[PDB]
Amino acid sequence: GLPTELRPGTNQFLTTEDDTAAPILPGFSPTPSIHIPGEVRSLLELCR
Amino acid sequence: GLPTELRPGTNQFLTTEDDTAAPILPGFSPTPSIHIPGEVRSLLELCRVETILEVNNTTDATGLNRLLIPVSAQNKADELCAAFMVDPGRIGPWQSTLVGQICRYYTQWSGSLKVTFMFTGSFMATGKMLIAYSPPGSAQPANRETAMLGTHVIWDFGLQSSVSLVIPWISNTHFRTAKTGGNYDYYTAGVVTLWYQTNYVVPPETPGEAYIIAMGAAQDNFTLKICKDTDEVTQQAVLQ
Amino acid sequence: GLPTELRPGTNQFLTTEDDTAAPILPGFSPTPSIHIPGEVRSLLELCRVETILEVNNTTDATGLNRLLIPVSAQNKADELCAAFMVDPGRIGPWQSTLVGQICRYYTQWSGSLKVTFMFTGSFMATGKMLIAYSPPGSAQPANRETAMLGTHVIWDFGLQSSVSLVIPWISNTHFRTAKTGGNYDYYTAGVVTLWYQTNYVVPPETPGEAYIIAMGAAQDNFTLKICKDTDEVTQQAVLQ
Amino acid sequence: ETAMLGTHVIWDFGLQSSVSLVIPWISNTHFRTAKTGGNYDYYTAGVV
Amino acid sequence: TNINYYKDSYAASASRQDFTQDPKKFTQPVLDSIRELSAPL
Amino acid sequence: TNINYYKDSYAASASRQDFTQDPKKFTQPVLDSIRELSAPL
Amino acid sequence: GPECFTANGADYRGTQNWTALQGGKPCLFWNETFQHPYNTLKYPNGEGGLGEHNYCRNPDGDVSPWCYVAEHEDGVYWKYCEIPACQMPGNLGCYKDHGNPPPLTGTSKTSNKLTIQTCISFCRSQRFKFAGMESGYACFCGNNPDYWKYGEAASTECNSVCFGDHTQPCGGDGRIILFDTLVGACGGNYSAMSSVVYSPDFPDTYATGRVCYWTIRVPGASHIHFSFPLFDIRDSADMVELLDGYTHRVLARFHGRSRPPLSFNVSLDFVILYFFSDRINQAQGFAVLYQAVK
Amino acid sequence: DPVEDIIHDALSSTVRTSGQDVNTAAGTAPSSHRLETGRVPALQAAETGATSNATDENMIETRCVMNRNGVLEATISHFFSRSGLVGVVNLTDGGTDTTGYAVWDIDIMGFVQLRRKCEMFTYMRFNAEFTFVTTTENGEARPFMLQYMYVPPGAPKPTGRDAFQWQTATNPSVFVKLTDPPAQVSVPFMSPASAYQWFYDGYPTFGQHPETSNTTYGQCPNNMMGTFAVRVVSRVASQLKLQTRVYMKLKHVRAWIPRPIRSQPYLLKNFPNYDSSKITYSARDRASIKQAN
Amino acid sequence: LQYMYVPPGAPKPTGRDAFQWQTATNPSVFVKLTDPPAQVSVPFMSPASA
Amino acid sequence: ETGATSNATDENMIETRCVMNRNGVLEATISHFFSRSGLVGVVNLTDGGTDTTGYAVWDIDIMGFVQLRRKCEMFTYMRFNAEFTFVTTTENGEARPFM
Amino acid sequence: VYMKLKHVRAWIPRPIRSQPYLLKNFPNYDSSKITYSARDRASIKQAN
Amino acid sequence: SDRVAQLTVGNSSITTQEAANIVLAYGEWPEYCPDTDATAVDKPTRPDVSVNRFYTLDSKMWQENSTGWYWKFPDVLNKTGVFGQNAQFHYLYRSGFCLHVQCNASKFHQGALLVAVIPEFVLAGRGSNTKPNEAPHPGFNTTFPGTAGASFNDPYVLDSGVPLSQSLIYPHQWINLRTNNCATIIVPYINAVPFDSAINHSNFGLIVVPVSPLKYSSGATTAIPITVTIAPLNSEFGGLRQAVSQ
Ligand SMILES: CCCCCCCCCCCCC/C=C/[C@H](O)[C@H](N)CO
Ligand SMILES: CCCCCCCCCCCCC/C=C/[C@H](O)[C@H](N)CO
Ligand SMILES: *[C@@H]1O[C@H](CO)[C@@H](O)[C@H](O)[C@H]1NC(C)=O
Ligand SMILES: *[C@@H]1O[C@H](CO)[C@@H](O)[C@H](O)[C@H]1NC(C)=O
């Protein structure tokens, strides 16, 4: 195989990292959305 | 070597992931296939074919007669022949059709459903029938003048003894779920009820009873959702 | 480092995987080769060469005479000289040929098989023989008029004393498996049987018995399947 | 189940109450003769 | 885009999913392809 | 397409499989290449 | 001697109530075990040793003696019982196979309707005094006396059914059973002391008109004591005759109408067992047991 | 030309349902009332065996819906993509059991939940992805090592713990530890036939077949595909009660000839024997006919 | 450990040796306790649109 | 008798047919015939109180075990590269924290 | 200790040894027990 | 204009006037073995007329309390017809059948019939015992009834543990005594192997189940029979050998 080494910082469930995870339902199509008013996209939108 | 770190989610035999595994016979050629009919490629392909409902699923109806609803002449008109809840995932008649068995393997279902009704009476005996689907809400109606209001199809006998009703997919949401009861009856899909339109009029020297075969299936817009272990297996002993 | 996760199937010394390993002598030049005859590149190359069958594999036939079938004149005609089951993986005569030994290393086999029959009789003694392959079904036939019906080859003596029969690959499936017995005899490939066509006619002052050497091999369409530990080794003690 | 083996025609009733069978001309020779009996039954043409 | 780390074919996972549905094999397996809204008999 | 992570040759697994069969080396190792359907003697 | 004569354990009515000597299960009594198919309510008057006990019997026609036991979710509702006493004379036990070299290095064959006696008819046709089955389809003759080379094994897992008849065992896959050739035959001479004389074509039904003469010539024996543990004759024309050897004289007669006693002493030194049968209707078989006491 | 009868059929012996690729759900167009005779889609003839094509547009005043519901998850490829239990072994390596090994013949019919899925299709063809989870009877993992040899049909089966078959110079084997994530192996379609068969309306052999007990019935060997053995890697016995489940996935699946779903409970492994005394009726029993719950 | 998702309508497990753990359709996570935490992505599986 | 193989092909004996075969010969070549790993030797490093050596030497001889031996006996001269694998365990099959 | 063979090139095929092995570096068999390759049958014309 | 029907194979020529709509199993006609897939290296045989006839099985009478019947294919034809004498002499076999079943009744009678082919129609021992060596099993004559065709014992589960309610996934056609007195199916060769034995492996079954019971007012024909006429198409045979009965 490819040679490699594990750096530090492994096996740590970081609360705020952003990685992939195994999909649980392979080949899944969600319920298609609907145009709903009031779509907020920021919290600064609510501070104003 | 290349530096790396193991994220969480390792060493977990996920039942439904899709990864490679080491080939066990390296450099292997399989037995070449053969063109065989009946190659199915989808389960929606099997929901579009009719199978009989055990609509007469009553005590004192055992044997083969569960598949047949009786039909006799009615001296008094405005009579109720039969009725059944259309919910496939729910228990009831749809446990005997395929589309209700295969729906149980999934959670949610959508799309229109259709039922046919083959008449098995004599050639000379004739009669009109009213097939009324009622959307959800109250229970099944009391008299046919209350069951009119849903989508209904009126049926005349003669040749070509199989009419088709199609229950249109009406629902607030995009998908109803198969489980029904408690609060999941919010996804109930109404009740189909069959009424004597006029009568079962018979000539002399002919049997004054008959039967109808209620066959059901799914319309072309049938679509399904995530998988689910069915309920019709409760193996206790390991098979030896 | 790069993020990653270990899927299942790790740390497993799979006997048949195909991966790299750390070179033990870094920067090594081997001894340069030399052009040597007999470079084989396939095992099918070895199935196409004849080796003798121990068709006379009987009690009271010990020594070298297991490789030879007797042939004598028959006062009464319509006589059975010999017979053997064609199944190579099955025990029997094919344990002594290579193609039956090498087939045991694999599970399944396909392709036509062929057998030759060299005559070792005198030059003046002559005779006709019938070599009949019977497909599967019933057992070996009783009389030759029942063994005709399979593919058969009639043989005349003279010069050029080696005829060739080829058992055509006939089977419902694409591959028979080497194991035979129980329910695996569904993959049985019939029986080859050799009959006296006319007689072993001998002149005076000549021995009235002879022998035939049954040599077998595989036809060009011989193809094999996944590997298998053979049966002809049962080492008990470690070799010291 | 022994009379199947010849050429046979199966008939259903209903309207159009006349079916047609045709006995095909099968014979070793080109012409059968009208006389039948003795050795002239060599020209017999079967039985319907 | 799916990739296989071995030179065998049967180590892939979902190498080609396919949409191909033929209701005519099972739902209408009829010689005389009946009309869509007419009288069959 | 097969790849080696070392600068030596003998760390590869199946670097080139090959179909090459020569039955004439063993099955018919004859001077006078006999005819395919004639009398050899 | 054995408490059992036939190769399944039907006549076995032993005192064993366990299912094994090592690691034995306390077996449940036949009179509470009613959810299982065999009990004593719908079986009155003891069809197959059934009563108020927990002894392993064979009321189903199976290949072994067994009973019914529960489990701690690590067992099946029955269990084959191992009894070291019910090994019929003519059974050399069952042994584990290994491959090459075989213990019986005689002639090996294979069929698909192989019952037991078809091999014993085959090793007798080749004068090999021991036989061998492998998992109901394979035959294995041979004269070798070193069958014990690989190891003795229990008689429980040696019980894969024969393909010929589905009521008797023909060993296991990789496990051999060994039956002698003197049984399952007739004729010959018995110079041994206390051997066992079985029916022609035992365990099978005797064939259509099997007529043959046994010979028991013992040197200097005072009296010969016969017995009839298994003796079931159905047609009257099928008879068994104990003849004198010197003068060819009739001494006793048994057939389907004259039932046998327990035993009776035959006080001579050279006796002949004569057997004659009919073509039409057959019966199970008979087993006897002589004791030359000087 | 010599005779027309032989060239006519041979020329006319040539080959005698172009379905489209459906990516989404089926939409619908509107429809108005139509009051005309001669044209009726309701009054079909289900007696011909055909499905009635009474589409929704042709019955009621429908609307226009451009659907978007995905049909991806309903195909057979992702219907069998789930792994599932197949067998358990009981490698009871202790003081009493002087074997040290346990052999188990591969039979997926042993457990119902995976069985009932593949019964829907009579002929299947696929590649497998086996997974051997490993543990003790207490669920505990320990520092030990196991061996997992596949023993094809005809191979010598292992005889004990120190057997020579574990030399495995040809048989594929998996050497794995018990403190390890589960071993996972892909397996190809290794049938001698062209496709697997869960059913066989006959016998493997020729000859007579009795009518009192037919144990050879319905046993095709093309699917019967050998055994699979396990030992702990040790020449002397370590006292532990082991029990390893084996799981498989089905990939690259191709089905054929759909079969109804079995409703009655299973009683045996290789035979679909039900019980006449307890016929499990598929539908639940209702009160009367006109009392939909 | 074993971690099976039991959707609505599925048979719920009854005990430790239950047949529902055969999980031929239900997604399950088989994981060890000496393991970094198991992590799984889950889609929007509502019957509704939101 | 000339030592040649008879070339009596199937077409030349019987009324054959047309078959365009597809059975793969990939797995029968020598490259994938020896690709299987296999046992070669065992060592007995009996490190204890009695045995005051602490080491065990083993000369490489693949002839020691039959199942790999009988394969390479089929070919008189061979040339290859090897991929050794040293599985490690105790007599009880137990793994331990050692080096 | 286990080994694999890769990049193999053979030469001069040799028959397969049938007799059991007795030594390591010498192919010594035993004259007293010649293991016959084929299993012993009943007679010549009795294919099992 | 559609009720009539004329099928003629071989020297036979069947006609039905009231029944309508031929249903073809799975939308593929019966065809010969292609060159690129066959394994039997020898030439197979194509009689195409002697064997491709409409052989008629025996009549089975329908009573008001009847249960059902079934057959097996090509098992029903091994003692009769040239096809019988062709299957006993050949190890290999391939054909595609043209089923056709008839049930005549008056316009005053009532009743229906489910006709369906069942691929690989195994049967099931009818017993609660799970002892492996004492397992109930169907006899030979029960699973291979021959030309006569045995009856069911519990048709609601097809004597195989499969509910009849779902039995329409298979190719089928309903006989219903108000509109059609007959039915027909054209089925191809369905087998995972290109050829098979003819006296060991039955390719498929056939079921004729009285779903709706025959009911008539008293004073009419009481004995209603059922006949099935069968006809192989594109038959094949290979591997000639001696006779084999079973
Ligand atoms: C060393 C690797 C061990 C894993 C390999 C074991 C062999 C796996 C072959 C899979 C064969 C197809 C799946 C088997 C299904 C059923 O057992 C049979 N079809 C009939 O019962
Ligand atoms: C530190 C690495 C340890 C592994 C290296 C050990 C040396 C391996 C050399 C392999 C030589 C060829 C294979 C040997 C085969 C037989 O032993 C000999 N041909 C004769 O017995
Ligand atoms: C077995 O032996 C006798 C009865 O046969 C009795 O004394 C003993 O307690 C029995 N044991 C069991 C476990 O039933
Ligand atoms: C059942 O049999 C056992 C053993 O003989 C006996 O102890 C018990 O009293 C019996 N019970 C009944 C109800 O007969």
Author numbering:
A (entry chain C): 1 to 48
B (entry chain C), C (entry chain C): 1 to 240
D (entry chain C): 145 to 192
E (entry chain D), F (entry chain D): 28 to 68
G (entry chain E): 29 to 322
H (entry chain A): 2 to 17, 21 to 297
I (entry chain A): 150 to 199
J (entry chain A): 51 to 149
Please give me the paper's original passages concerning this structure.
Receptor binding has minimal impact on the capsid structure; structural superposition yields an RMSD of 0.5 Å for Cα atoms between mature virus and complexed-virus protomers. There is a noticeable reduction in the amount of bound pocket factor (to perhaps half the level seen in the mature virus particle). Residues 29–322 of KRM1 were modelled and two of the four glycosylation sites (N45 and N59) have well-defined density for the first glycans. KRM1 binds CV-A10 with a relatively large footprint (~1400 Å2) and the first two domains of KRM1 (KR and WSC) span the virus canyon, each making interactions with both the north and south rim. Although KRM1 dips into the canyon it does not reach the canyon floor. The KR domain engages at the narrow part of the canyon, contacting the C-terminus of VP3, EF loop of VP2, and the HI-loop of VP1 from a neighbouring protomer. Notably a loop spanning residues 98–102 in the KR domain, disordered in the high-resolution crystal structure, is ordered in the complex by a strong electrostatic interaction between Asp 102 at the tip of the loop with Arg 239 in the HI-loop of the adjacent CV-A10 protomer, whilst Tyr 105, Trp 106 and Tyr 108 in the same KR loop make weak interactions with Lys 140 of VP2 (Trp 106 stacking with the side chain stalk).
The icosahedral capsid contains 60 copies of a protomeric unit composed of four proteins, VP1-4. Enteroviruses are unique in harbouring a lipid molecule (pocket factor) within a pocket in the VP1 β-barrel, which lies below the surface of a deep depression encircling each fivefold axis, termed the canyon. Here, we have determined three cryo-EM structures following mixing of CV-A10 Kowalik strain with KRM1: the CV-A10 mature virus, a disassembly intermediate A-particle and the mature virus in complex with KRM1.
